[PDB]
Design an enzyme around this catalytic site. Structure first.
Site, mmCIF file in Angstrom:
data_model
loop_
_atom_site.group_PDB
_atom_site.id
_atom_site.type_symbol
_atom_site.label_atom_id
_atom_site.label_comp_id
_atom_site.label_asym_id
_atom_site.label_seq_id
_atom_site.Cartn_x
_atom_site.Cartn_y
_atom_site.Cartn_z
ATOM 1 N N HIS A 182 0.345 -28.230 -1.345
ATOM 2 C CA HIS A 182 -1.061 -28.122 -1.666
ATOM 3 C C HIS A 182 -1.677 -29.427 -2.217
ATOM 4 O O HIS A 182 -2.871 -29.557 -2.218
ATOM 5 C CB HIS A 182 -1.276 -26.990 -2.657
ATOM 6 C CG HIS A 182 -1.094 -27.427 -4.065
ATOM 7 N ND1 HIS A 182 0.133 -27.447 -4.688
ATOM 8 C CD2 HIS A 182 -1.974 -27.959 -4.940
ATOM 9 C CE1 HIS A 182 -0.006 -27.948 -5.902
ATOM 10 N NE2 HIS A 182 -1.273 -28.254 -6.077
ATOM 11 N N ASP A 183 -0.867 -30.385 -2.649
ATOM 12 C CA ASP A 183 -1.384 -31.687 -3.106
ATOM 13 C C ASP A 183 -0.884 -32.851 -2.218
ATOM 14 O O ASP A 183 -0.817 -33.999 -2.635
ATOM 15 C CB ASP A 183 -0.965 -31.914 -4.543
ATOM 16 C CG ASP A 183 -1.964 -31.385 -5.538
ATOM 17 O OD1 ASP A 183 -3.187 -31.381 -5.310
ATOM 18 O OD2 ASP A 183 -1.588 -30.948 -6.607
ATOM 19 N N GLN A 211 -8.571 -30.730 -25.054
ATOM 20 C CA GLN A 211 -7.711 -29.594 -24.732
ATOM 21 C C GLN A 211 -8.294 -28.279 -25.257
ATOM 22 O O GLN A 211 -8.221 -27.273 -24.557
ATOM 23 C CB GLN A 211 -6.259 -29.826 -25.205
ATOM 24 C CG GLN A 211 -5.621 -31.016 -24.535
ATOM 25 C CD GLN A 211 -5.365 -30.732 -23.047
ATOM 26 O OE1 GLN A 211 -4.578 -29.856 -22.737
ATOM 27 N NE2 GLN A 211 -6.100 -31.385 -22.174
ATOM 28 N N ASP A 254 -1.386 -23.723 -10.286
ATOM 29 C CA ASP A 254 -1.747 -25.109 -10.318
ATOM 30 C C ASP A 254 -1.942 -25.617 -11.745
ATOM 31 O O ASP A 254 -1.601 -26.741 -12.044
ATOM 32 C CB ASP A 254 -3.000 -25.346 -9.480
ATOM 33 C CG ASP A 254 -3.168 -26.811 -9.058
ATOM 34 O OD1 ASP A 254 -2.211 -27.583 -9.062
ATOM 35 O OD2 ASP A 254 -4.263 -27.269 -8.720
ATOM 36 N N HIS A 306 -0.045 -35.800 -9.994
ATOM 37 C CA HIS A 306 -0.120 -35.045 -8.712
ATOM 38 C C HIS A 306 0.939 -35.473 -7.706
ATOM 39 O O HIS A 306 0.635 -35.939 -6.606
ATOM 40 C CB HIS A 306 -1.501 -35.144 -8.088
ATOM 41 C CG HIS A 306 -2.547 -34.392 -8.834
ATOM 42 N ND1 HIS A 306 -3.290 -34.961 -9.849
ATOM 43 C CD2 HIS A 306 -2.932 -33.097 -8.766
ATOM 44 C CE1 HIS A 306 -4.123 -34.059 -10.342
ATOM 45 N NE2 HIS A 306 -3.919 -32.916 -9.708
HETATM 46 C C1 LIG Z 1 -4.420 -29.389 -19.248
HETATM 47 O O1 LIG Z 1 -5.624 -30.146 -19.386
HETATM 48 C C2 LIG Z 1 -6.541 -30.256 -18.377
HETATM 49 C C3 LIG Z 1 -6.255 -29.899 -17.050
HETATM 50 C C4 LIG Z 1 -7.244 -30.036 -16.088
HETATM 51 N N1 LIG Z 1 -6.961 -29.716 -14.834
HETATM 52 C C5 LIG Z 1 -7.836 -30.004 -13.860
HETATM 53 N N2 LIG Z 1 -9.133 -30.275 -14.114
HETATM 54 C C6 LIG Z 1 -9.518 -30.616 -15.360
HETATM 55 N N3 LIG Z 1 -10.886 -31.034 -15.521
HETATM 56 C C7 LIG Z 1 -11.735 -31.379 -14.374
HETATM 57 C C8 LIG Z 1 -12.345 -30.127 -13.705
HETATM 58 C C9 LIG Z 1 -13.019 -29.249 -14.725
HETATM 59 C C10 LIG Z 1 -13.916 -28.297 -14.275
HETATM 60 C C11 LIG Z 1 -14.569 -27.473 -15.167
HETATM 61 C C12 LIG Z 1 -14.326 -27.597 -16.538
HETATM 62 C C13 LIG Z 1 -13.403 -28.552 -16.997
HETATM 63 S S1 LIG Z 1 -13.221 -28.615 -18.839
HETATM 64 O O2 LIG Z 1 -13.340 -27.279 -19.193
HETATM 65 O O3 LIG Z 1 -12.008 -29.143 -19.350
HETATM 66 N N4 LIG Z 1 -14.492 -29.622 -19.435
HETATM 67 C C14 LIG Z 1 -15.797 -29.209 -18.881
HETATM 68 C C15 LIG Z 1 -16.847 -29.995 -19.670
HETATM 69 N N5 LIG Z 1 -16.618 -31.438 -19.548
HETATM 70 C C16 LIG Z 1 -17.569 -32.147 -20.425
HETATM 71 C C17 LIG Z 1 -15.257 -31.883 -19.896
HETATM 72 C C18 LIG Z 1 -14.214 -31.038 -19.183
HETATM 73 C C19 LIG Z 1 -12.750 -29.383 -16.096
HETATM 74 C C20 LIG Z 1 -11.747 -30.417 -16.568
HETATM 75 C C21 LIG Z 1 -8.549 -30.503 -16.401
HETATM 76 C C22 LIG Z 1 -8.801 -30.863 -17.733
HETATM 77 C C23 LIG Z 1 -7.829 -30.750 -18.701
HETATM 78 O O4 LIG Z 1 -8.118 -31.067 -19.993
HETATM 79 C C24 LIG Z 1 -9.380 -31.662 -20.395
HETATM 80 MG MG LIG Z 2 -4.818 -30.450 -5.738
HETATM 81 ZN ZN LIG Z 3 -1.842 -29.332 -7.837
#
Ligand SMILES: COc1cc2ncnc(N3CCc4cccc(S(=O)(=O)N5CCN(C)CC5)c4C3)c2cc1OC
Ligand SMILES: [Mg+2]
Ligand SMILES: [Zn+2]
Length: 307
Positions: free
Chosen positions: A100-101, A263, A211, A62
């Protein structure tokens, strides 16, 4: 300036490269080409940019690089939808992406809450995102930094509200609700771009798409950026353990071998729906979705050895 950049910056999958000193002029080109050449005063914009940079931190993901990269995505999803967004939205959104960050420390809103961080007490919801906007306003109020000075007081308040909502929309927690509301509008044919409340949703979805845009680059970029994303996730997981709390596996470095499964999860539940809904509303953003699907496929090869 570079000719290879003048051309390749129009690609959705453009990468801004390792030369940090080139990012400012990559951003000014984008603003110039998106907004106008006389819409911002060069010398003031130039220092606004330099002060934003200064207030970003040396975190793995970030960081300033992320800020300019998210801005670039928004540039590609403005250039490819000429006539859909106003001059004001185009100015505000490019700036919202750059800001934004601001002052991100590499930690999630959950972690600040569990840590009892002062910022949590102040901003209960969307904690970091409220802080980022607050820092944006502080940069703008610094003498010499009001890029918006040529503007009426009303137009100023308007652009800051556009910026505010867009920054807040980068709280991924809000995306799920936003996207559900948009998907129902799509399907009932009720989405109305003439309606400001609906426009707010669309921009929110655009801020999410931008983002998350690491997942829309070509595979060698995506894979490498994922190293930085997990570097922060693991650091947060370490800090969670230090508090007395088992982190979710996503954040637990002892479960690093499950990143591919991780992923799959993120692409199916978040990225593919995000860029699908975006494509439905703005058809020219299809290359984002195509690249995301290609990347999902790559993570799928990784799980069975092929890579
Ligand atoms: C490019 O790779 C990224 C980018 C990501 N960018 C930002 N947030 C990420 N977070 C945190 C906010 C969030 C909210 C809702 C669902 C998820 S999820 O779908 O991945 N999963 C939900 C279920 N839990 C058990 C494990 C995570 C996330 C994962 C994330 C995660 C990520 O790969 C893991
Ligand atoms: Mg942010
Ligand atoms: Zn960002």
């Amino acid at each position: 300036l570079p000719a290879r950049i003048c051309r390749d910056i129009e690609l959705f999958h453009f990468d801004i490269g390792p030369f940090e000193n080139m990012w400012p002029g990559i951003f000014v080109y984008m603003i110039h080409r998106s907004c106008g050449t006389s819409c911002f005063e060069l010398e003031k914009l130039c220092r606004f940019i330099m002060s934003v940079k200064k207030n970003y931190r040396r975190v793995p993901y970030h960081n300033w690089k992320h800020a300019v990269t998210v801005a670039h995505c928004m540039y590609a999803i403005l250039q490819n939808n000429n006539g859909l967004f106003t001059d004001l939205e185009r100015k505000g959104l490019l700036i919202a992406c750059l800001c934004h960050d601001l002052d991100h420390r590499g930690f999630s809103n959950s972690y600040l809450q569990k840590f009892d961080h002062p910022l949590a007490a102040l901003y209960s919801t969307s904690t970091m995102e409220q802080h980022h906007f607050s820092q944006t306003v502080s940069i703008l109020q610094l003498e010499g930094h009001n890029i918006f000075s040529t503007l009426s007081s009303s137009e100023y308040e308007q652009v800051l509200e556009i910026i505010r909502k867009a920054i807040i929309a980068t709280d991924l927690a809000l995306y799920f609700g936003n996207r559900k509301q948009l998907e129902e509008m799509y399907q009932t044919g009720s989405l109305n771009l003439h309606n400001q409340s609906h426009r707010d949703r669309v921009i929110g979805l655009m801020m999410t798409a931008c983002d998350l845009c690491s997942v829309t680059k070509l595979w060698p970029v995506t894979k490498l950026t994922a190293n930085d994303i997990y570097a922060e996730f693991w650091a947060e997981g370490d800090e969670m353990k230090k508090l007395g709390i088992q982190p979710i596996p996503m954040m637990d470095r002892d479960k690093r071998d499950e990143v591919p499964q991780g992923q799959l999860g993120f692409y199916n539940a978040v990225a593919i729906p995000c860029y699908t809904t975006l494509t439905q509303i703005l058809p020219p953003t299809e290359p984002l979705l195509k690249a995301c699907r290609d990347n999902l496929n790559q993570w799928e090869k990784v799980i069975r050895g092929e890579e």
